[PDB]
């Protein structure tokens, strides 16, 4: 329905809205485009669901996130992928990990602080019908 | 594997 439509594209704002959040902040520069195969021709070899947050932009607008929990799966994905990336104990490595964590934690509380309970649910049960 | 260093 319209009404339904209207739920999906308020979720689209919120995730935007959060994504550029995240974006923007300087500690997540490394996570803001894919990992360049010219630059880093072994990560494929490695990293088999490579993501980062223009993806996850392109993703929202072409309307594949039904729900916060789908999203929060391409985040989960973006700090999964550098920790197996880049799990050795050098500091550069464990810079990139910490950076991953925090990237991950603050997704998950501006979500808890900002998005609705009933509002998510509601997704949900539209997904969930179709 | 890593991009550190």
Excluded: W
Aim: aromatic share 8%; net charge negative; proline share 4%.
């Amino acid at each position: 329905s319209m009404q339904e439509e209207d739920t999906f594209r308020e979720l689209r704002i919120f995730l935007r809205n959060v994504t550029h959040r995240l974006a923007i902040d300087k500690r997540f520069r490394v996570f803001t485009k894919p990992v360049d195969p010219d630059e880093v021709p072994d990560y494929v070899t490695v990293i088999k669901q490579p993501m980062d947050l223009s993806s996850v932009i392109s993703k929202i607008d072409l309307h594949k996130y039904l729900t916060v929990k789908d999203y929060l799966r391409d985040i989960d994905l973006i700090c999964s992928n550098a920790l197996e990336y880049n799990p050795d104990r050098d500091p550069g490595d464990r810079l990139i990990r910490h950076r991953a964590c925090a990237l991950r934690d603050t997704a998950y509380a501006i979500i808890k602080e900002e998005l609705d309970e009933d509002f998510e649910q509601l997704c949900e049960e539209i997904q969930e019908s179709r | 594997r890593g991009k550190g260093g």
